[PDB]
Every structure is written in C-alpha cells, then in structure tokens.
Amino acid sequence: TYKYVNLREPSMDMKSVTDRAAQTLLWTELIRGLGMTLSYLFREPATINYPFEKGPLSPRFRGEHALRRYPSGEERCIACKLCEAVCPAQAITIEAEPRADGSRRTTRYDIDMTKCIYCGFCQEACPVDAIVEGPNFEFSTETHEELLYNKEKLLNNGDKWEAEIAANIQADYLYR
Amino acid sequence: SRGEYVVAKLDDLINWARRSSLWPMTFGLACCAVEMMHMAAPRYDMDRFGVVFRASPRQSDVMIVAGTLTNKMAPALRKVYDQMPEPRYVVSMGSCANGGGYYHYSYSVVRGCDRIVPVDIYVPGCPPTAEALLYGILQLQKKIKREKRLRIWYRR
Amino acid sequence: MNLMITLLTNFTLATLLVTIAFWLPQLNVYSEKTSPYECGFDPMGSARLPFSMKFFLVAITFLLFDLEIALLLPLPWASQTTNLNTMLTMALLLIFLLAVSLAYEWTQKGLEWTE
Amino acid sequence: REKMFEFYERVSGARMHAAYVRPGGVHQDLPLGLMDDIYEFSKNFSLRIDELEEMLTNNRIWRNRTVDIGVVTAEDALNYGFSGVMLRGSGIQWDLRKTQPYDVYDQVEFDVPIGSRGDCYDRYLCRVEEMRQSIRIISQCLNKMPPGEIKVDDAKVSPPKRAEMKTSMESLIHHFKLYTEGYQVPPGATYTAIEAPKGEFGVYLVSDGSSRPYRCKIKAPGFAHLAGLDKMSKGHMLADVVAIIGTQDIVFGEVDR
Amino acid sequence: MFMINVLTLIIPILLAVAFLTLVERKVLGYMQFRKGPNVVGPYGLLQPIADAIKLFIKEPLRPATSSISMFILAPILALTLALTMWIPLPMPYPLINMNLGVLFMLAMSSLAVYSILWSGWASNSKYALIGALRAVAQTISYEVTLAIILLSVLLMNGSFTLSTLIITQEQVWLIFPAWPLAMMWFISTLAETNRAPFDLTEGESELVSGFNVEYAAGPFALFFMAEYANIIMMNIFTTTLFLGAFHNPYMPELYTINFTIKSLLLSITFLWIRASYPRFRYDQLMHLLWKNFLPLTLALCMWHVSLPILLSSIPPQT
Amino acid sequence: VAAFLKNVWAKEPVLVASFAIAGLAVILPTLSPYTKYSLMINRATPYNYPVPLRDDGNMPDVPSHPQDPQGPSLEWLKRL
Amino acid sequence: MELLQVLKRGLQQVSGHGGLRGYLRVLFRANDVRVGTLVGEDKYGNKYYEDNKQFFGRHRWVIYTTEMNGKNTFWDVDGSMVPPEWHRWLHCMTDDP
Amino acid sequence: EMVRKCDPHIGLLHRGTEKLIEYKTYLQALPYFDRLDYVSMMCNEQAYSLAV
Amino acid sequence: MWFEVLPGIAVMGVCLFIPGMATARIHRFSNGGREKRVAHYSYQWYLMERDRRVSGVNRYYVSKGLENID
Amino acid sequence: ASATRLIQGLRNWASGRDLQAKLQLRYQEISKRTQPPPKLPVGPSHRLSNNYYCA
Numbered sequence A: 001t002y003k004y005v006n007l008r009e010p011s012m013d014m015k016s017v018t019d020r021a022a023q024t025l026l027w028t029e030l031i032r033g034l035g036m037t038l039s040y041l042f043r044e045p046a047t048i049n050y051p052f053e054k055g056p057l058s059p060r061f062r063g064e065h066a067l068r069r070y071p072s073g074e075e076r077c078i079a080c081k082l083c084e085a086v087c088p089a090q091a092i093t094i095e096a097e098p099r100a101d102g103s104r105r106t107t108r109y110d111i112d113m114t115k116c117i118y119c120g121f122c123q124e125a126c127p128v129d130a131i132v133e134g135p136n137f138e139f140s141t142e143t144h145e146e147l148l149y150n151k152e153k154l155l156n157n158g159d160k161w162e163a164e165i166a167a168n169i170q171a172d173y174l175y176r
Numbered sequence B: 001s002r003g004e005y006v007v008a009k010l011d012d013l014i015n016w017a018r019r020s021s022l023w024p025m026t027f028g029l030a031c032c033a034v035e036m037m038h039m040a041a042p043r044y045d046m047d048r049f050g051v052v053f054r055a056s057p058r059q060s061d062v063m064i065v066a067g068t069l070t071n072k073m074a075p076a077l078r079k080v081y082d083q084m085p086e087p088r089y090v091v092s093m094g095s096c097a098n099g100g101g102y103y104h105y106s107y108s109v110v111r112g113c114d115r116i117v118p119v120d121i122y123v124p125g126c127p128p129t130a131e132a133l134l135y136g137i138l139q140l141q142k143k144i145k146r147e148k149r150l151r152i153w154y155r156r
Numbered sequence C: 001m002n003l004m005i006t007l008l009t010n011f012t013l014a015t016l017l018v019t020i021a022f023w024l025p026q027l028n029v030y031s032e033k034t035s036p037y038e039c040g041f042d043p044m045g046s047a048r049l050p051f052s053m054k055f056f057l058v059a060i061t062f063l064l065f066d067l068e069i070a071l072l073l074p075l076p077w078a079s080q081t082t083n084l085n086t087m088l089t090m091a092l093l094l095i096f097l098l099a100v101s102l103a104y105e106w107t108q109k110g111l112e113w114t115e
Numbered sequence D: 001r002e003k004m005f006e007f008y009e010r011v012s013g014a015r016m017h018a019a020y021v022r023p024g025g026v027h028q029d030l031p032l033g034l035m036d037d038i039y040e041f042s043k044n045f046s047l048r049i050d051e052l053e054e055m056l057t058n059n060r061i062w063r064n065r066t067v068d069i070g071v072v073t074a075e076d077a078l079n080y081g082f083s084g085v086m087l088r089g090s091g092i093q094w095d096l097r098k099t100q101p102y103d104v105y106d107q108v109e110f111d112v113p114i115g116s117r118g119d120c121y122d123r124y125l126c127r128v129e130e131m132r133q134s135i136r137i138i139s140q141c142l143n144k145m146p147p148g149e150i151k152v153d154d155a156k157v158s159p160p161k162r163a164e165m166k167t168s169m170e171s172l173i174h175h176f177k178l179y180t181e182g183y184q185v186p187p188g189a190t191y192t193a194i195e196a197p198k199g200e201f202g203v204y205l206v207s208d209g210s211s212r213p214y215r216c217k218i219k220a221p222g223f224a225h226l227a228g229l230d231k232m233s234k235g236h237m238l239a240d241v242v243a244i245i246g247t248q249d250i251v252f253g254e255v256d257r
Numbered sequence E: 001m002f003m004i005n006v007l008t009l010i011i012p013i014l015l016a017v018a019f020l021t022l023v024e025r026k027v028l029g030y031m032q033f034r035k036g037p038n039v040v041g042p043y044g045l046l047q048p049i050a051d052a053i054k055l056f057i058k059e060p061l062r063p064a065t066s067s068i069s070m071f072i073l074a075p076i077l078a079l080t081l082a083l084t085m086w087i088p089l090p091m092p093y094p095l096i097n098m099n100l101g102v103l104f105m106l107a108m109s110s111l112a113v114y115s116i117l118w119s120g121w122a123s124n125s126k127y128a129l130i131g132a133l134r135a136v137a138q139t140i141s142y143e144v145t146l147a148i149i150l151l152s153v154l155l156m157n158g159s160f161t162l163s164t165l166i167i168t169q170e171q172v173w174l175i176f177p178a179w180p181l182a183m184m185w186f187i188s189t190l191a192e193t194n195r196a197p198f199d200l201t202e203g204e205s206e207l208v209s210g211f212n213v214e215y216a217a218g219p220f221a222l223f224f225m226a227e228y229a230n231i232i233m234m235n236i237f238t239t240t241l242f243l244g245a246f247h248n249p250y251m252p253e254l255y256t257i258n259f260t261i262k263s264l265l266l267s268i269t270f271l272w273i274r275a276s277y278p279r280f281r282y283d284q285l286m287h288l289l290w291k292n293f294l295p296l297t298l299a300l301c302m303w304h305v306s307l308p309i310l311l312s313s314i315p316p317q318t
Numbered sequence F: 001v002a003a004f005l006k007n008v009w010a011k012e013p014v015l016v017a018s019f020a021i022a023g024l025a026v027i028l029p030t031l032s033p034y035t036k037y038s039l040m041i042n043r044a045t046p047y048n049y050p051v052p053l054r055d056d057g058n059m060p061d062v063p064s065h066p067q068d069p070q071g072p073s074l075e076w077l078k079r080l
Numbered sequence G: 001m002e003l004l005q006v007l008k009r010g011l012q013q014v015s016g017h018g019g020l021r022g023y024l025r026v027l028f029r030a031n032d033v034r035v036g037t038l039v040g041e042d043k044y045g046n047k048y049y050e051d052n053k054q055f056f057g058r059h060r061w062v063i064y065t066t067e068m069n070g071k072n073t074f075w076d077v078d079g080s081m082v083p084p085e086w087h088r089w090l091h092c093m094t095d096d097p
Numbered sequence H: 001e002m003v004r005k006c007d008p009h010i011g012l013l014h015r016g017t018e019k020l021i022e023y024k025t026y027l028q029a030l031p032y033f034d035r036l037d038y039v040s041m042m043c044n045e046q047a048y049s050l051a052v
Numbered sequence I: 001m002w003f004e005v006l007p008g009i010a011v012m013g014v015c016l017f018i019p020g021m022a023t024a025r026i027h028r029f030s031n032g033g034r035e036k037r038v039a040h041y042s043y044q045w046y047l048m049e050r051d052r053r054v055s056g057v058n059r060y061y062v063s064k065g066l067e068n069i070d
Numbered sequence J: 001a002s003a004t005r006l007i008q009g010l011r012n013w014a015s016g017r018d019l020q021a022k023l024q025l026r027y028q029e030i031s032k033r034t035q036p037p038p039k040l041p042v043g044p045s046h047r048l049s050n051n052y053y054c055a
Ligand SMILES: CCCCCCCCCCCCCCCCCC(=O)OC[C@H](COP(=O)([O-])OCC[N+](C)(C)C)OC(=O)CCCCCCCCCCCCCCCCC
Pocket: A024, A025, A026, A027, A030, A031, D060, E180, E182, E183, E184, E185, E186, E187, E197, E238, E242, E273, E288, E291, E292, E293, E296, F011, F012, F014, F016, F017, F020, F021
C-alpha cells in the first residue's frame, strides 16, 4: 500500500556501466528532452482565436448579474432580501416599500460588483428566480463606479440577456 | 491642414506600437494570478497579442494587479508602480483589487487598488476567467488605440 | 584603415541609438521612479558593500591558466618547424604541466567553492 | 489544468472557486455527460505525466538542482510540524487518506509514494507519483459511482430542492430560514484535518450554539513548511533556496489567511 | 565604396536580430504547445517592428544611484562589440579579411563581457551586482576552454584565418574529425552567450533581471539586440568552424545560402535548447567547464597537436 | 586492473576518456611510421630563397639547373 | 505524396473566401484563414461558422460585422458584440444554433 | 550568495479571513475556504464541510 | 500550424543573405569584376603594390598582359 | 488529428510514444453540449410514512 520512489540500485556489469558512460559522455537523456520538445513543435497548438473563438462554457456558468421578469413584463423581485441575507460579501443592498398598486417591490436593488464574489448564492436563494447570475463575463469597465449596479442596470441586464438566461435556466433547473 | 494629418498618423503609429507590444510584469497577489497564468496558458495565449511578461518594472508596460491588496504590501505596490516608466498602465483584476472584494470590511485590506495607483481597466470577477482577463487586456489595447498624444501636443 | 572606419561606424550608430533613446520620449522624473529596485520594499544598505567571492581560488588560477593560451597558441605555427620531435615533446610538456596543475588543484579541493 | 477547470465550470459554474462541496454533501448533482468527459480526460492524462517525467526525472540538469538540496531529517520533520510530501519525501509513512481516512477513502485502493533521501528530488517524484495515484483513484471513483441524492436529507441542514420549495410549506420555511439565519451548529469545538494535496489541512472550528462560528482556526501545511524553510536553506545558495521554496509548495492565502 | 559595405553588413544583421525576436517567440511558442505572435502582423511578421518602436518611445529612466557614465557606456559598448564581431566572418568573403581573425573573435568576446559587467556595477543595485559577478563566474569558467577548443580545431586549419577555414573543409566537414571538440564548443558558446541552460546573468527566477534590471527601455534595447547579434554571429562562427560549406569562386551565393541555412538551423537549435532544459546553478556551470570539459579539452589538445605530426598531415600556414 | 578500471569508468568516465586520449597522444607518435614524413615535409617546404653556389669546379652533387637529375627530389611526397 | 494535398487545402482555403481579397480580409481581421460551414448570420452581420473537424474550441467561430450600432468594427472587433441568442452556441452552452 | 539567514516576512496577503468568518454564517463562511489554498479549492471545501 | 514559423525564419534568412552576397558583389565592383586581392603576407602585398605601379592608372586591379610588352 | 502521416510519424518518433492514440486535443468523442433533461432521485426521508423527524 506504499511504494518506494527512488530506491533503485544501478547494475554493475560492464554492459550497463558502458551504457551509462555513453549516456554521460554522449548526452542521451538530453537528446530525449530535445526530442520531446521537437515532438511538440510539430503539433497543433491549443490556442483558440480569441475574440473570434470562445472558451467553452456550461449552462451553470456564473457571470454578470441580472434581474429577471415574468413572461408578462412584471418583474420577479418581491423584496424579500434573502439574496442580501445570504450574500457572503454584503454586495446587495435592498430598500423597499409598497408601490402604487400595493405590490411588494423594491425601490433600491444595488449589487456592488466589486464586492461580489460571484459564488451564486443569491441566485440559489431567490425563491422566485429574480436575481440570477447570467452568462456575460465580458463586461470590464474603464472606471470603478460603472461596476456598482443599481436596479436599473440589473433590469437592463435582464432585458438584454433574457433570451439566453431563460434558456440556461431551462437547461439547468432540474438540477437545482 | 497637413501637420494635423502628420501628427494624426504619428499618433496612430505610436498607439499601434504601444498597444501591440504590451509587456506586463510578473506580479500577482492571490487567486487571480492563477487565472492570469491561465491567460498565459496555451489556450488563451497572451503572447499572440504581443503580451509577454518582463519581471522588472523598468521594462514593463502594464501592471495587472491580480489578487488582493493588503495593507502590508500597498507601499510595495506603490513603489513597484512608481518604478515603471511612462507610459505605464494598470489593469485591476478581480474583486479584491477592484473594490476590496470578499475581504472588503477587513482590517488589513486596501479597499481597491485605486486607492493606491491610477487604474485604467477594471476586470470584474472572483476570479474573472482568463478569457475575461484577456477581454480586459484587449479593451486596454482599444483604450491605447484612441490616445491623442501628439494631436493634443499639436493643438496646445 | 578600414578597421577604424568600421569601429567608428559601429560605435557611432550604437551611440546614435542612445541619443535618440534619451531625447525622443517624454520624461516625468521624480525621486521615487529613479529609486533603487529591491522588489518593492526599500533596499537595506548599499549595493557597494563587499560582495564576498566564494570562487576566489578559481579566480586566481584562471589568471595562471589564461597565460597557457598565450603559450599554447603558437602550436599551429610551431608545427611548421624543422625540429619537430623537440617541438612535440615541449608541447606535450606544456599541456602536461597544465594538467598536473589542474590535478593538484582538484586534489586539494581548490576547485570547490568555500563555505 | 484548463480541462479540469472546465470540469469545475461544468459541475459548479465557476472555474476556480466553486463553493460546491458544502456541509451536508455537495450543492448540485453532476450534469449529464460529465463523467464520460472525466473518463476521456483520465484516459489520456498518463501520457502527459509521462512526458513531464521524460523532460525532468532522468534529466541531469534537473537532478543537479534537486538531488543534494533541501534534505530534511525525519525527527526534524516531525518536530517542525511538516505534513504530506514533506514527511513522505523523508520516508515517514503517513497519509491521512490511509491512516485517518475520510469519506470513502477506505473504499478506494491506491499507493502512497515514499521518498528515500528527504531532498527536493524525492519530493518531486512523490508529487509525480501522487498524480499517478490520483488518476488511479479517479478510475476507481468513476467505476464505483453510486446512484442517489447529493445532499443530506435532514432538510434543517441542507436546503430543499427548488421544485419542492415552491410547493411545500415546510420546505419553503426551511429554505427561508437556511438562507437567512442558517442552520444552528451545536456547541463545541472540533479539529478536523484532511489530506489536502499540500499536506494536513485542518479546521479548528468552535461553535457556541448559534448559526455563526465562534472561532475558526485554519491550520495550513504551508505555514509550518515555510517555518522550516530557514533550516532547509542552510548551506545552500539563492538558486537552491528557490528550489527549496518550490518543493515546499506554498500558497500564501492559506499561509496568511 | 567600403562604407556602403559596412552599412549593408550591419543594418541587415540588425534586421536579422529583429526577426530573430519573432522567430524566438514563435518557435518557443509552438514548442510550448501554444502559438507565438500572429496578431500584430500577418502571422506576427510585424511584431518586432512594434517592439523596436515601443522601446525608443518609452521613458529611459536613468536611476538616482547609478554611476551615469558607465551606465550609458555599457549598452553602447554592448551593441558596438556585438556589431563588430561580424567583420572577420567569411560570407564567403569577410568584411575585413584578418590574418588572425579567430583571435579577433576571441578578444572581442573577452571585451564584450564588460558591457554586462559595467552595467551590473554602474546600476547601483543588489540584483544587478549579483548578475554582474555571476558574469564574472561564468566568464572565468568558459574562457578556460574557449581558447583551447578553438586552438585544437585550428591545428587542422594551419592558421587563425577564418577564410582559410573554408579551404580546410573543402573535402570533409571539420565536425567529422573533431566532433568531441564540436559538441564541447557548442556548449562553450551556449555558456559564452548567456543562453539557457546557462542564462545565469539575466536570471529570471533567481534574480529579477540580473544586470539589466535597472535598464528601462531604450538602453535595455541595446543589450537585448546585442545578445541576439551575439547568438547569430556565434552560430555563423560555429558553422564556419565545423560545417563549412562548398565554395565556388565564381558563384559565391551558393556558399552564402548554404552557411545561411546551416546557421539558421543552429539558431533554431539554440531556441530549442532554451525551450527544453532547466537552468544550471552557476557553480555547477563552473564545475562543468573546469572539472569535465577542461580535462578532456587538454587531452584533445594533446591529441590534436600530435595527430597531424602522427599522420604527416600538418596543414599549411599559407 | 580491470576492477579499478571499471570502477573509474563507472564513476568518472570523462577522466577515463581523458587519460586514454592523452596516453594515445603520448605513446602513439613514437610508434607510427609517418612521423618521419612530417619532418621531411616541413623541411621540404621552401620558405626562403635557394641561394645559389659559386661553382669552384668540384661540386658533382649540386646541379646547375633545377631540372637536372642531381639534387633533392620530392617524388616521395608526390607518391606517399 | 501528401504535401500536394496540403497545398491543395491551402489553395482551396484561398478559394473558399471569395478569392485573394476576401482571403486577405479574413487574414488581417481574423489571423485565421480556414473555411467553415456557415451556420448563421444575425441581424447585425456577424457570421457564425462551424468546422467539426477542428478541435473543441476551434470548431465554432464568428466573423464579426464591420458596422454594429454605428461604430466601425472593421478593426475594433469586440467579444461583447455577440447577441445573447448566439452566445449559447458560440460559448458551447448548447449544441443548437 | 551562500545563504546565511532566511527571514520570510509574511502577512502581505493577510486578509483577516478567520475574523470575517466569525461575523458570517457557516454557508457564508464556506467561500472563504476556496480562497485559502487557491489551487486546492474543493479540498478546502471538503475539510470545512467535514468539520461542520 | 507549425509552418507559420516558416515565414519569419525566411525573413530572417533574407536578413542573413543580404550582407555576404552584397560584399561579394562589392568585391566585384571595386576590383574590376574579379575577387578581392587577399594580402595576408607581405609578399602578396608587394605583388599587389607592383600591380598598382605597373597598371599606369594607379589601380591594382587593372591588369596588363603581353599587350603591354612589345 | 489533421496532421499528415509524415509529420505524424516524425512526431511519434520524436516523442517515442504513440500520440494519435492519446490526443490531448478534444474532438467529437466528448459529450454533447445539449443533454436530455434528467430525473434526479430523492433521498431516504422522502416518504409519507414512518418518517418522524425525531426518529
Ligand atoms: C556544433 C554542432 C553540434 C554539436 C553537438 C551539440 C548539439 C546537442 C546539444 C544537446 C543539448 C545540450 C545542452 C547543454 C547541456 C549541458 C550539460 C552537459 O552537456 O554536460 C556535459 C556532461 C557532464 O556530465 P555530468 O555532469 O553527468 O558528469 C558527472 C561528473 N561527476 C561524476 C564528477 C559528478 O558530459 C561531459 O562532460 C562530456 C563532454 C563531451 C564528451 C565527448 C567525448 C567524446 C569521446 C571521446 C573518446 C571516448 C573513448 C576513449 C578513448 C578511446 C581510444 C581508442
């Protein structure tokens, strides 16, 4: 149930001594290393042509956050604050009140993307599938405050990426 | 005018030579540097873009702050950034370098490297993927492409 | 004459690649960019302190073995003489004396580094 | 390593930091088609270990940088609190997947590589042979995967499914209270240490009955290994101390917390 | 019309250095299962132009503690001695046909070390000091065989004339009677030119950059292009020594094409050794060129003195 | 002697090859028939001018023209 | 000989891009000249290609449009230009275009 | 270059993880463990999971 | 694939073909359509200076044969 | 897997191993990106009787 790595004694007949002396004087293992490197020279490299070719992803992938809607236009977020109660970095800040038809909705739904740890506890804690962490990962900004999303930016992320987020939830939701 | 055309083409030449020869520096801090090594890995391959590491700050062009900036290393970060010759750029990788991240309310963490150095590109993620980091690097190249150095010299 | 012209050309466009390296870009000089590099933290002491050589006996014996290729170097020409067995004996005497010196430097552990 | 990060990204949604293995099991079941791709990876990974070992193990320049470098005696290894390969390079037959086994490591058969000289080179060979044995354990785990659920069915600890959270009342209450307050851990303290690939990685967890930890000390192997760096570096040079810091595989996030 | 001959020598062997940077990065990439540059030009063919423009529009950064005179003189002397070691190389005709061109190559090798050496001293830094005295430890290791190997190979030539070395190898290559000298000279030129496994001066992992760790862009360019001019000149010199080709006095371009492709194959061989080996510790460097190569080099020096006498095959000195 | 020779060929084959090549370079020109021909070629190479002689009357071994049959000849070099 | 087949595949890659002009177009915009089965084209002009004989990562690509939302994207191709319905197919979140 | 004393100053990445764990729940304290040994992620998850 | 290193090498090949080829042509332009005279030894220089003296145009490469004598 | 048999044979000789049998670049042998919808099993406490939580 254990093995001795490097407990080999070399052979001391004249054949193996002459073989190791030819290995020393004529550099056999160095030519082995050169041969393996030359073998990789004649291969197809694994370099995908970004930005035209993309690394493969799954429908579980956790990227940019987005607030989803029902298939009628109504937003899903009913202000229940589980996503900011389970958020391990306190990136989500929610302020709510009954809106003009008496419905439980949010007035403030902020996600600080520069506190966010992209672990997806908010999308698995949301009882109505409102907050999700969608597929976008190419959203680098040139200023810090552009990565402090309010409710408007997250709803626009949902309206932007809904035709993909709905399909990824349709692909994965039986595992959840 | 002719001189505006000449300084426009020379701006295009120097912006081409600076965005197509970015030399980052071997400088990571935390988990993002593993992914930054994956951006150097043969799948995404920074070196096809001219992006290749130089360990010294004197011969580096961009500093990718890849990881968590604590209080104990913030003067080391500032002196490393200071020892880069101009033009030098800063790409902030990951949430801890962007805004403190998962250690934001900590006693020992600088809440974003933009308290220390001027930051050009903020790359979001924990970690951002190597593809997202390469997206941020190509956005930095697009930011260098639209610089107007000699035009603003010609107009001032 | 051609050697001086060639050396002047090489030195000239090696120093005209430096005078267009210092005067062409834009400088922003301040007294932290020109600080000594010590991987981010401030250097402890000077780099003009004594940097103790471990390979010092090999460094001295290099000065006694580098003279040998001021002595063994006429051997392509010394083979062109008409007293040739004497030349061959003296040549093998010189390489043998170099070899006996190297053997003595081995056996007293002179080629090893200190500490 | 990129392909295994694709395996993480498929099973959990993130390439590096998954938050997948949770108290109670794992978060989410394996997606369909994952294990067949793990088989297609593990079928070919041995040739990669072979060509790494071709480039380095019998190479004379690799040996002259690592054979007489960083020798650790056994008693000074136990005294310095070393663990993992740092013990196993020195010949200390100790592996927590054998001696103090956890979840199903007593149900998988593998070997433990034992070094002979305590140097950087035997620790290199121990890490290469642990890659070999990890391929062996992945073969045994792909063959012996059982059907069933992936969380503990104590639904006051692990959350219910979303198909039953939206239908049952108790499952909705348990979802609510586990994602806001969380489960209450009973009072007491444990020290649970596993064989991480760097050595004995421990958690000393102190709970006071609440839903939050009272204390959580993180024992890292790299802390004690980097402590022993100062003995291991004696009589060597800079180009050897870089090999000693290599063979003490340090990740400083666990060294510094 | 000799100044035009000097320019048509030294400007294409700057363009060859420039595209050697691209060949290095791409052959190094395909040996590392990746690609090299292919974005900047059509399959990377304009990447070195971007690197050459970039280093001379970046701020030069003369340091505060640097002794400035030697700090500026070190890359100037680097690129000067890198260019001027190409002039006795027969291509099949050298620029300056020297009767003792081999000793010119050897002495200007010995003077090129002071570029690295004064750069490490003048840039008053600790890593630069380590990179300079590791160049001392490397040069006292390779110079103690670089002259005896090059002596033993010219005992079949008759002189120190590099142009006569074409006439010497008109029948057989001089690697066939002297392949131990050839395989030892090749490692001595690896250790001469600070290339891997004998980097040891610009140590990326021990040091940060070694001697040129303070040199920002512009002066750093004249160490890097100097080093690559040294490796192309050194493979051309190795090719002239051991793989000397057919020379037609009426068709010189045949010899030019032939030694060009041979020296390109040896340049790819340098890139392929740099892509495959760990780096020596710089004492094991010294215990190689003194304890292993030097005894056998003395033995082969005895053999190559006695053997033209032994077979009545002493070559002519004229 | 084969035991010590195999021991030094097992530990230090570089030095065994060194002493073998050096011993051949020592002893082998003393056992070769061609070492005389080296000296004969070197003293048969005309660097200087063959300064002629005033013919006193009795020098029968010295020619009066280079194509005369008396004098030193290099037919041994042409054949070898 | 099979090097002749290699030269024939190179010349039919020159043929498959509409000649030398389109060959140089996809060369200088893509740094990649291999042909592909045209899977689709969105409402912006981004063309989406398969080649299942390539390896996993190279088997699906996009040639971006030259004008998207008023910006000249001839040289400034961008990863964020892909619409979300093609972002599953291109990133291999599904087999289905 | 012979090393006479090594003093590794650490804490340049001391984030104060295990004080932040005290103010967060067990599920919220789980992703701190991914970032300790950030090349051995699910092993740290497994160790924390076995402790809890 | 790997043959994409073959353009750059080829460019480097031309950048090693240009010097030596040129100097051969330069040795055939300054020296009357022939090779450059090699004077390693002072006798060769004496013959070369004799050629420069007997050319009549103060150029060593302009040769004079039996047409110069009667 | 698109390499010529000359380059394939040179590559197999240089590495000393059979490389087309074990390729590190993935092709159509891998799993499909679109999978059928699963039916995940339930645990032992998903019963309607003899399922008192205190037991
Ligand atoms: C110039 C054209 C090409 C030439 C060939 C070179 C191309 C191939 C290069 C491959 C990559 C090498 C990269 C650098 C590697 C550095 C390491 C290295 O080489 O170390 C040297 C190694 C060192 O070996 P080592 O380091 O293992 O030695 C251990 C030493 N002790 C025991 C003291 C610890 O080998 C040598 O030194 C051998 C030198 C060459 C030997 C040539 C001998 C020829 C045969 C002579 C005759 C033999 C029979 C006796 C007489 C019989 C008479 C009848």
